[model samples]
Target: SMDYLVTEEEINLTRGPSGLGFNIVGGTDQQYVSNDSGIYVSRIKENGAAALDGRLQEGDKILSVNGQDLKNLLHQDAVDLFRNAGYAVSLRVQHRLESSI
Candidate 1:
C-alpha cells in the first residue's frame, strides 16, 4: 500500500531515574530514513519516560525539542540540544503510523 497515516504531536517527558528513557538518532548527517534527513527516535528504553508515555515510537520524526526547531541540524548539534534541555523536555514530532490498511 502507498498510503500511510501522519500526525503531529507534542510529547511531554520528564527526566527520571533512567533519564529521558529514549535515544535520538539521525539528522542531516546521514539521512537515516529514506530521503528524510531529520532527527528520529532510535530506541525507547524499557520502563523509561518514553515507554511510560507509550506514544513515542522508533522511526518517528522528531521536529523539535522545547520549541527549538531541529530541522537541518547535524547529529552532534541535535545531541547538544537534548543534553542541555533541562529536566522536562517538550518534544514535537511527526508520527507516521506503521499499521498497514
Candidate 2:
C-alpha cells in the first residue's frame, strides 16, 4: 500500500500588484476584474517570478485557455486551475473596455 501526503498553506491573493489581483469598476456591464483570464496574455505572472511579462493587460476578459473555454467558472475554481498549471499557460482573451465613461 502507498500513502499520500497532503499539505496546504494560506496564500494571500493580493500580496503584490502583479501576482493575482482584482479591481472593481462601476458602470453599465462593469464589475470586478481580474488579471487571470483567457482574454489577456500580457498580465500573466510567471511561475516563480514576481511580475507579469506577457502582452496582456488589465481589463482583459479571458475566454479560453489552451482551447478550453471558460464559460462559467467559480472564482476560486479559476484561481486553482491557473495555479495548478504550474507553467506558462497560453490563453485566448477578448479585449474590451468596460464602459464609455
Candidate 3:
C-alpha cells in the first residue's frame, strides 16, 4: 500500500531586461488546431532565472505573463508575450505534486 500528497501552488517570476533565459515547449492544440493553454514548463535551465527563483518546477503551468492572463492565448502568442516582455516579466504559475510512501 502507498500514500500520496498532491499540492497546487501559485507563484510569480520576473525576467530582467535581457531575456527569459530558459526554454518552453509542448502542449496540445486548441480549437483552431493550434497549441494553446500551453505554458506548461517542459524544462527549467540550470542556475537560470526559474531555477534561481526556487518556486517554479518542471510541471508548473504558467497562468499569466505580465498579468495578462494565459488561460486563453495561442501558444505562439504566449511565446511572443514572454519574448517581448521588456525589463521585468511577471508570471503567474500553477504547480501540482504528489508524494508516496
> What local distance difference test score does each model get?
0.83, 0.41, 0.62
Residue 14 lDDT, candidate 3, scale 0-100: 64
Model 2 per-residue lDDT tens digits across residues 1-101: 21222121222232333444332122222224443323222344454232333334455556654455555555455555556653345555554544222
> Which residue pairs clash within candidate 1?
none
Evaluated at residue 25, the lDDT of candidate 2 is: 26
| Model 2 regions lying over 4 Å from their true place | 1-54
Q: How close to the true structure is residue 10 of candidate 3, measured as C-alpha lDDT?
A: 55
lDDT of 2: 0.41
Model 2: ten consecutive residues of lowest lDDT: 2-11
**Best candidate per lDDT, number?**
1
Per-prediction TM-score to the true structure, in the order listed: 0.85, 0.46, 0.67
| Order of quality (lDDT) | 1, 3, 2
